[PDB]
């Protein structure tokens, strides 16, 4: 016969790139947008803005 | 049915918590620095 050597994703290396988190009710709440902005830095230039 | 938006996720470590200064009266003596 032959076995099926399973592989875990968290035990891989690629997992560093993404943060995985389970969201149970998403498919229900996915009917609308979530729409969060993030940031943008800005220097303090001289002269009045 | 005119789909809408929803409340955006907030980072767990979000620590605005500056209204302690801004609630009614600010006590700058030692409360600052934690912000």
């Amino acid at each position: 016969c032959s076995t099926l050597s399973l592989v875990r994703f968290l035990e891989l290396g690629l997992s560093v790139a993404c943060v995985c988190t389970k969201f149970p009710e998403l498919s229900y709440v996915a009917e609308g947008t979530i729409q969060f902005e993030v940031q943008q830095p800005m220097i303090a230039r001289d002269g009045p803005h | 049915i005119e789909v809408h938006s929803h409340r955006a996720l907030f980072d767990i470590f979000k620590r605005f918590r500056s209204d302690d200064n801004n609630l009614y009266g600010a006590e700058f003596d030692a409360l600052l620095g934690t912000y």
Partner: peptide
């Protein structure tokens, strides 16, 4: 963690590095 509008105001894997 789903909250309403209520408000306040490891292991050892084999990998290559």
């Amino acid at each position: 963690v789903i909250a309403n509008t209520n408000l306040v105001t490891s292991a050892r894997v084999r990998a290559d590095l």
